[PDB]
Symmetry: D3
Subunit: 143 residues, 6 copies
């Protein structure tokens, strides 16, 4: 059955996780983003930070923990016609923060979509994936 894995007996260690996500743009959406309801990139960046803090409330079996660092970047890559979101979360705990990084990116992407769907309902959040993490038994991991 589902359960929040017991990690009470594990030491408190430095954890970090970095993830990224992309939103593929149409020419219509790109134009809009270049013109600036508000700036999609700015609002999305903040939504990502807020989302990182709300992660345990969204992911059922996720361990609630105090975050000591959250960085989110939402950039427009004109030539590639897409928005790149990257998030790095840190803490000191018995479990990792991969979910916090992944959720920050996903919600920032959803926010970019929210800000541009008026003219482009077909915009796709192409990928959401982990790039790196450190801490824990498994140790350092890189894509």
């Amino acid at each position: 059955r589902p359960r929040m894995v017991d990690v009470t007996e594990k030491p408190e260690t430095f954890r970090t996780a970095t993830a990224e996500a992309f939103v593929e743009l149409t020419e219509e959406a790109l134009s809009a983003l270049e013109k600036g309801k508000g700036d999609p990139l700015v609002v999305a960046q903040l939504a990502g930070i807020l989302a990182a803090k709300k992660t345990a409330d969204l992911i059922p079996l996720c361990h609630p923990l105090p975050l000591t660092g959250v960085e989110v970047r939402v950039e427009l890559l004109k030539a590639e016609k897409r928005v790149r979101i990257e998030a790095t979360v840190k803490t000191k705990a018995e479990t990792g923060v991969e979910m916090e990084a992944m959720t920050a990116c996903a919600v920032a992407a959803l926010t970019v979509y929210d800000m541009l769907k008026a003219a482009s309902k077909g915009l796709v959040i192409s990928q959401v994936r982990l790039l790196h993490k450190a801490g824990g038994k498994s140790g350092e991991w890189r894509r």
Copy 2:
């Protein structure tokens, strides 16, 4: 500047939105999902419904509204080696529920990832996209 668009003077109408998302599986993850911390597909399905209701709290400029229907499906597509998530949300309001459908799919996908990252940290949430919506000025829309 950012703002929650005023729709106070628009009539209250029947709205619907359907979105989908995918999680690409490695052979390791597929095996695990076939064996059943809990069943990833079951937990994710519920997380999606819960997420739909929490949408306005996650998307900054999203209009808060009472939902009258939420359907989420999380299925394993063995041959394609991936999990397909689909969500349909309904309501009667002055704005659409595309964000609720998109967020339900994104969070369900994040939950599948949470349940399988132990052995496969590189799993990717490949896409999150709108499939259909009805209601509003623009009328019916299909991918």
Copy 3:
């Protein structure tokens, strides 16, 4: 599979629900309540109102809706050595508010327990049950 039942096509009607709960007291707990960390009955009464509003966030398949009325009463029944909690919730919607009434009572009871567990950890929340409801196809119902 689990789902938030579609009620989009049902008319918006006047709904009401009343529930109750009890906390059985030991002589130690009764004495404390008579002496007044704060007054358990006062804090619990407010927690119940707050809980009614948070119901859809706690009950997975519960329909989110705006409440138009919430009444909670937390009384000490000395001779019976127990605290009686009663809650009545109202709204205009396509679904009932039995869950809101039940949850308000349950959380108020949990709060009374929180305020008195220091000296009496064995206190029991004896019952939580629906007393009445009106509105909907089934019509009026009474215990």
Copy 4:
């Protein structure tokens, strides 16, 4: 006046708490549960875990803390015609997690009720009580 008791100067220690709750079934409800809106027992089990994490938000004077473990079990006891819910929560803190265990059980019970009230509005959540706890000055306690 009400207050969140100051425990800043107390050491951080291993805490655990176990509680249980029951839902008394009618023959109608029992039949339904045996046939499986979704499986009441499965949805309730998850709601309990989620509820444990939301405890401090529901109980006014409750201390917010990171949980390191949450286990919830929702079982059908056919002969006894009732559902038994049990929850064990763990953490390392200056205060106990009795409220987290009690709330997990109460919300799981409320969810079972939500899933079966359609046909049986009179179902009763008979009891919610603490079974065990460890850690803190008072030490180990058992019902």
Copy 5:
């Protein structure tokens, strides 16, 4: 005793509310704001919109309702050495949205303080007051 006033029998009407708040700046804080952890005015503006939506969760007896419009402005008034926050909220309901407007301003002000307290811990949120409201029995009201 406390209670969420019953307004179930009142018609659903157009409501609006406008409030404002100020943050008095020291020369140190003013300099910082002119140089731009992020832009205090931008982050605060978004926090205000988010806060408006979370109002019923923060104010105990406040009626939960769907908002149809939220506008927040956070401006620097150099000569006056202070930040002026203004918020207008709208909806269609049985109760007003004065609390939503007031809370949006208060939280935006708290956010400006958060972004500038590093160098100026003594900054004061001088006032938070209602400027206008319409709808309801009392009708239109202006400061």
Copy 6:
């Protein structure tokens, strides 16, 4: 760009913060408060404690952390015709709790306003300011 400042490498230390806020009363409001929808001072006091715990969810870049102590006082100062709110929050962390103290006072003030706006919509929350804090590099600070 906005970011939750990284404090992962800072030691965990004892932090404390005290803030205050005022609500200026009209003779109408004063009379009401002396007569006792519920007692504004009692409801506001609890809202303040609850608000302290919800601070990180309201202030975008605020670090989420477990609080070990929360004290809130809401008093009527008849001669001065105003309500004085004071809040002290404590914890052990890498960052301070000034925001928790400030937010507790602001929300308690907003609640007093909510409870008295029926007859006095023009009531003003005159000030919200930090009175003291300890812990951190900067050390002890007093107004």
